[PDB]
């Protein structure tokens, strides 16, 4: 569901992602999502407009917008957070990637 954060059930250095696909667009078995990387892993030279920083509990995360991907429903784990309050920033990031913005 759009703007919800889920555990990623695949062996990977990524552990969480945020669903960013429209809820009115049905793609059976798949959802487009943006993976999260620990914010400590990226410097301030990295655009926050394109790669937003989000805080979930005691962790800070960068949204790796350009590494977005549709994933199989089989790797979508439990919901762990909601980022709907960051809709404007997320929309701005995705629209920047495609349309420069």
């Amino acid at each position: 569901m759009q703007f919800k954060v889920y555990t990623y059930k695949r062996e990977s250095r990524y552990r969480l992602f945020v669903d960013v696909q429209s809820d009115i667009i049905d793609t059976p078995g798949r959802r487009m999502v943006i993976p999260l990387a620990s914010a400590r892993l990226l410097s301030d030279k990295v655009s926050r407009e394109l790669y937003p920083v989000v805080h979930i509990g005691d962790e800070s995360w960068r949204m790796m917008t350009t590494d977005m991907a549709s994933v199989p429903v089989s790797v979508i784990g439990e919901e762990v957070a909601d980022l709907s309050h960051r809709e404007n920033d997320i929309k701005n990031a995705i629209n920047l990637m495609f349309w420069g913005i």
Binding site: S12, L42, S47, D67, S70
Partner: protein
């Protein structure tokens, strides 16, 4: 304005690309075609 955006961000974008190369691409992990 576009060149201003590219310039402000050239270092950061190079940094992200290196990060993805090292960390693994989520996209590559999941592409089904």
């Amino acid at each position: 304005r576009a060149e201003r955006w590219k310039a402000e961000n050239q270092e950061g974008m190079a940094e992200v690309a290196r990060f993805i190369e090292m960390n693994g691409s989520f996209a590559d992990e999941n592409r089904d075609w």
